[PDB]
Amino acid sequence: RTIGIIGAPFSKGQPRGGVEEGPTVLRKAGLLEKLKEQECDVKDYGDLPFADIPNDSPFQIVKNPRSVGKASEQLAGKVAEVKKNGRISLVLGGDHSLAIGSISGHARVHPDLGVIWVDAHTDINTPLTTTSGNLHGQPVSFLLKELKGKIPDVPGFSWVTPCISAKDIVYIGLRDVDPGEHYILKTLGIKYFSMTEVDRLGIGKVMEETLSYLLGRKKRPIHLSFDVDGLDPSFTPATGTPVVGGLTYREGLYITEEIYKTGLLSGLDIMEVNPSLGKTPEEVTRTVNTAVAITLACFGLAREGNHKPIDYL
Amino acid sequence: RTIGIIGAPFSKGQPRGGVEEGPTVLRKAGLLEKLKEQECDVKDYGDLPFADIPNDSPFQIVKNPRSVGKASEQLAGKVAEVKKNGRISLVLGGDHSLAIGSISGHARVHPDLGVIWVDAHTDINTPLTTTSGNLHGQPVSFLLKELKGKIPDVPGFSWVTPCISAKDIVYIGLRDVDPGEHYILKTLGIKYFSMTEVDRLGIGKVMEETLSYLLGRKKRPIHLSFDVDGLDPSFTPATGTPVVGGLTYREGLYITEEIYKTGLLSGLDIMEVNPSLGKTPEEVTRTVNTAVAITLACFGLAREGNHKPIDYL
Amino acid sequence: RTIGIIGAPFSKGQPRGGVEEGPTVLRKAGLLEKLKEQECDVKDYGDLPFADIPNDSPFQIVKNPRSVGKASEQLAGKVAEVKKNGRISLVLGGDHSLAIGSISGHARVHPDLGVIWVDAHTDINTPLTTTSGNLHGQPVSFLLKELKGKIPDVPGFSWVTPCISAKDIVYIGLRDVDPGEHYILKTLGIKYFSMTEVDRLGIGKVMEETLSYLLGRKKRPIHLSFDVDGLDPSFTPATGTPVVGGLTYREGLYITEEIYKTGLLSGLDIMEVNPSLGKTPEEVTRTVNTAVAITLACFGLAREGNHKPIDYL
Numbered sequence: 043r044t045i046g047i048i049g050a051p052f053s054k055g056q057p058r059g060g061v062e063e064g065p066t067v068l069r070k071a072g073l074l075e076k077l078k079e080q081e082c083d084v085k086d087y088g089d090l091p092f093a094d095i096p097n098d099s100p101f102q103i104v105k106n107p108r109s110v111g112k113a114s115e116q117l118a119g120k121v122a123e124v125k126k127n128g129r130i131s132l133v134l135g136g137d138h139s140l141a142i143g144s145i146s147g148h149a150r151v152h153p154d155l156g157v158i159w160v161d162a163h164t165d166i167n168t169p170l171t172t173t174s175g176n177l178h179g180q181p182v183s184f185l186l187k188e189l190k191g192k193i194p195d196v197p198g199f200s201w202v203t204p205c206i207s208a209k210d211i212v213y214i215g216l217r218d219v220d221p222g223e224h225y226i227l228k229t230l231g232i233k234y235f236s237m238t239e240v241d242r243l244g245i246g247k248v249m250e251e252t253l254s255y256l257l258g259r260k261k262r263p264i265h266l267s268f269d270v271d272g273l274d275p276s277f278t279p280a281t282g283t284p285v286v287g288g289l290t291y292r293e294g295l296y297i298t299e300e301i302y303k304t305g306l307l308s309g310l311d312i313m314e315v316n317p318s319l320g321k322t323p324e325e326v327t328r329t330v331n332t333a334v335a336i337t338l339a340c341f342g343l344a345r346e347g348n349h350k351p352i353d354y355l
Numbered sequence: 356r357t358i359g360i361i362g363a364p365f366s367k368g369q370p371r372g373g374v375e376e377g378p379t380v381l382r383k384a385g386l387l388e389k390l391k392e393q394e395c396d397v398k399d400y401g402d403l404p405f406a407d408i409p410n411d412s413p414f415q416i417v418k419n420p421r422s423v424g425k426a427s428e429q430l431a432g433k434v435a436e437v438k439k440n441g442r443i444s445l446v447l448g449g450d451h452s453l454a455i456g457s458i459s460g461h462a463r464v465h466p467d468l469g470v471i472w473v474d475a476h477t478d479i480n481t482p483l484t485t486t487s488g489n490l491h492g493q494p495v496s497f498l499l500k501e502l503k504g505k506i507p508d509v510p511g512f513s514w515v516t517p518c519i520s521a522k523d524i525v526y527i528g529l530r531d532v533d534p535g536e537h538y539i540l541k542t543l544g545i546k547y548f549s550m551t552e553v554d555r556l557g558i559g560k561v562m563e564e565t566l567s568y569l570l571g572r573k574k575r576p577i578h579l580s581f582d583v584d585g586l587d588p589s590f591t592p593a594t595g596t597p598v599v600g601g602l603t604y605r606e607g608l609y610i611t612e613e614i615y616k617t618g619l620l621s622g623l624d625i626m627e628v629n630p631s632l633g634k635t636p637e638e639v640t641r642t643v644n645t646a647v648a649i650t651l652a653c654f655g656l657a658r659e660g661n662h663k664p665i666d667y668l
Numbered sequence: 669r670t671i672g673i674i675g676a677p678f679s680k681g682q683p684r685g686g687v688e689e690g691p692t693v694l695r696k697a698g699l700l701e702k703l704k705e706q707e708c709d710v711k712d713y714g715d716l717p718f719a720d721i722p723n724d725s726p727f728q729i730v731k732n733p734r735s736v737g738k739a740s741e742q743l744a745g746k747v748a749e750v751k752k753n754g755r756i757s758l759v760l761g762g763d764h765s766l767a768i769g770s771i772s773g774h775a776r777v778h779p780d781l782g783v784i785w786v787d788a789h790t791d792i793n794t795p796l797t798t799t800s801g802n803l804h805g806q807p808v809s810f811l812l813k814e815l816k817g818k819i820p821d822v823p824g825f826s827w828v829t830p831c832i833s834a835k836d837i838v839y840i841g842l843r844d845v846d847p848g849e850h851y852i853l854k855t856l857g858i859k860y861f862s863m864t865e866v867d868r869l870g871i872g873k874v875m876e877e878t879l880s881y882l883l884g885r886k887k888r889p890i891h892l893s894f895d896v897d898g899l900d901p902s903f904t905p906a907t908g909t910p911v912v913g914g915l916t917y918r919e920g921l922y923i924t925e926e927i928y929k930t931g932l933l934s935g936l937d938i939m940e941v942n943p944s945l946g947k948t949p950e951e952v953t954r955t956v957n958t959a960v961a962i963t964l965a966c967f968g969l970a971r972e973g974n975h976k977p978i979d980y981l
């Protein structure tokens with residue numbers, strides 16, 4: 043598969059700072075090379091230089107809005123640029139607020155995209171429903187067209203144009219959803235598979251319904267926004283908001299292996315990896331190793347094996 | 356949901372003493388408040404004062420029969436009292452022998468009840484089949500009508516009247532069943548889903564069949580006797596008789612979420628939590644945290660989220 | 669069930685030496701007795717004395733070929749001897765190269781056998797496809813008739829006669845397969861259930877299809893070659909080549925419980941247990957305990973319980 047790597051060392055979407063190092067440790071794990079070790083054509087677009095914005099007081103309760111707003115605007119342009127070069131955008135975060143720019147830049151080139159959001163949270167709070175003020179928990183509210191009119195003019199996001207309907211997104215892995223967020227889910231009829239549904243149906247049926255839900259009518263580009271805390275913290279502990287009872291390592295690989303097999307992966311986000319939150323050096327490597335594995339699976343690595351079209355005997 | 360909390364700090368049903376502290380640490384985890392934080396109407400009936408019975412020599416091989424017998428008699432009355440106040444009895448144990456009084460007091464008010472027993476063990480040994488003499492492994496033999504006549508007159512249990520047929524109970528989580536207990540299962544035709552069945556069918560189908568088995572004919576009150584060792588010891592280690600290969604945290608939450616959704620939960624037991632058996636302070640908090648989560652799920656907490664009937668936007 | 673225990677303390681199939689102690693620690697865990705504690709008729713044939721072969725230089729890239737070749741030849745005769753005494757051969761390894769002699773000696777007495785290979789690897793590299801040269805990763809290539817002609821004359825294996833077709837074997841647990849090995853899988857049409865399939869279908873359906881695939885046409889003797897690294901390293905860490913995302917303890921017990929229930933188990937291999945690779949004394953006991961449990965399940969131990977044909981009441 044053909045890839046376009048984009049490092050997004052941003053953290054102002056939430057309180058903890060170590061997430062900016064995500065691009066660094068993932069590249070350090072040898073992600074670029076391992077992808078190349080596969081049938082992959084990789085082009086590194088570099089780590090986005092997120093210039094400082096010293097003056098950025100809260101918007102009501104919303105924190106660092108100008109910084110978060112600019113980082114997504116910068117990222118949106120980069121993703122659109124890689125999508126125009128005919129490559130799958132691979133955004134290494136960074137907190138999940140960056141999803142706003144990633145899905146935005148993607149839709150500029152591919153407006154018919156479908157989103158699969160793997161996360162323990164829905165990240166669909168509005169500036170008015172959020173109680174924490176952390177924008178990494180509001181990315182989805184800015185992208186939904188149905189929520190246009192409920193999103194006040196927050197400094198830094200005047201460039202945003204809702205680009206996805208409630209029916210063009212599927213959540214997988216939910217287990218920590220706020221009351222207002224749950225109201226929006228049920229109100230806009232958003233398709234989701236929380237841990238309850240995964241436990242009931244099995245990851246296989248879950249993925250079956252997910253892809254059929256998004257590709258039933260017609261084939262379209264797929265955007266995978268993967269928050270590493272969607273997986274159980276026993277696999278990805280070095281993350282800002284871990285929630286027990288998460289997706290297993292195996293389910294995480296199953297999800298991505300299936301998405302790969304559709305041949306429609308167009309955009310990918312690997313977010314919330316925070317090395318500084320690993321209680322040990324091993325928890326840090328465990329998180330990075332798991333994040334790399336999910337990434338490789340998105341581009342071809344199959345657990346049953348892979349072989350080149352040649353006679354090996 | 357409307358609840359009636361009853362602390363049952365009892366341990367004489369087995370050798371290890373720390374189980375009496377169960378009510379204490381669960382309340383200390385803020386269980387009462389967290390329930391209230393939900394759509395719950397809570398009334399604390401207090402911790403049952405289990406007076407000492409210094410003279411209580413074994414009955415043949417059966418240990419502390421008078422103490423265990425009195426504690427269940429005392430508890431049976433309390434549960435019946437809360438069931439008459441129109442509230443779901445929530446008994447915080449304490450060893451599982453207390454189930455004898457809980458299910459007894461429940462049936463006095465609701466004789467048509469159905470029991471779901473989540474445990475790694477069947478706890479259906481009779482005074483004559485048990486090899487350990489620990490009554491926390493015999494509670495079910497005293498309640499089954501079919502076993503009336505095989506239960507000798509043990510000091511402390513003259514007040515007992517079998518109140519459930521073999522067909523009114525479903526076991527879930529079995530993985531350590533004695534030979535005589537297995538004989539009784541197959542002989543009385545008791546419905547069970549051991550870990551083998553959970554592995555074969557999946558927790559979803561397991562719960563589907565469980566509820567259909569008990570509510571097929573008609574809707575009736577449900578009694579959930581939950582032994583925390585039914586879950587894998589990686590989740591609830593501070594318990595007297597842990598057995599590897601247990602139900603996962605997720606399956607445990609799935610079970611209870613489904614029971615809640617029936618709207619028929621009438622009685623609930625959270626047993627065998629023993630803080631003093633935690634090899635570390637974390638194993639103790641891990642056990643308590645997991646016990647609280649299963650409890651909250653029984654009364655409404657859903658992993659997909661919850662919201663009040665109001666317009667959040 | 670009637671058993672014939674054979675200790676195979678061999679390690680020259682791979683670099684790490686501690687695997688030779690497998691028979692020792694498994695017997696030390698009280699395996700013989702625990703089997704007897706069940707409905708089992710056990711006869712210990714002893715630990716095969718694998719005489720030294722000082723002169724054994726590599727064959728091209730293949731390491732210790734004469735040593736590995738002789739150990740399998742010796743083992744093949746022992747297994748055939750126990751199969752003629754009407755007993756299920758239970759080979760305690762030892763690295764997995766010994767499978768060559770075990771399945772060989774088994775087929776001498778029961779040529780219509782069917783093989784179930786539980787392993788994280790396919791172990792089907794040929795002397796020409798292997799990149800490591802470790803024979804414990806080539807056992808299957810020597811047994812397949814379809815691969816006859818692609819297996820050069822390696823010193824120590826002139827006694828070998830391919831005894832199984834590609835269609836008489838089923839793989840379960842795959843997650844680390846080489847490119848050439850994957851080519852052979854797809855080329856000979858070998859039936860396999862990698863971790864992806866287990867995640868998709870569930871262990872129940874996996875076992876359903878496995879047994880139907882092998883016993884569909886007609887009932888035949890079953891050979892179970894179980895590599896302990898097929899299970900997740902959180903359960904069996906003391907093994908030379910652990911791979912994360914493996915079969916759970918429960919799935920491992922489900923697999924064997926089902927095989928037992930067919931009443932067709934004829935040959936069993938418990939391989940790759942290496943005590944010296946346990947980072948702690950507990951990792952060593954955890955591995956051994958799990959290896960014993962899978963073994964007991966192969967001969968009757970059911971998680972739902974077991975009882976003698978007598979009236980327990």
Ligand SMILES: Nc1ncc(CC[C@H](N)C(=O)O)[nH]1
Binds near residue numbers: 271
């Ligand atoms: N990725 C990620 N971790 C936590 C969030 C937000 C959760 C919370 N409901 C909030 O509104 O801040 N998003």
Ligand SMILES: Nc1ncc(CC[C@H](N)C(=O)O)[nH]1
Binds near residue numbers: 451476
């Ligand atoms: N909750 C609970 N843990 C262990 C038991 C009894 C098990 C054993 N068969 C006995 O008869 O004592 N019950």
Ligand SMILES: Nc1ncc(CC[C@H](N)C(=O)O)[nH]1
Binds near residue numbers: 793846909
């Ligand atoms: N049991 C077992 N662990 C590792 C292997 C071989 C794996 C590798 N493909 C090789 O060719 O050496 N077999």
Ligand SMILES: [Mn+2]
Binds near residue numbers: 138161163165178269
């Ligand atoms: Mn997120």
Ligand SMILES: [Mn+2]
Binds near residue numbers: 161162271283
């Ligand atoms: Mn999240």
Ligand SMILES: [Mn+2]
Binds near residue numbers: 474476478
């Ligand atoms: Mn119990």
Ligand SMILES: [Mn+2]
Binds near residue numbers: 474476582584596
């Ligand atoms: Mn128990």
Ligand SMILES: [Mn+2]
Binds near residue numbers: 764787791804895
């Ligand atoms: Mn192997």
Ligand SMILES: [Mn+2]
Binds near residue numbers: 787788789897898909
């Ligand atoms: Mn292996």
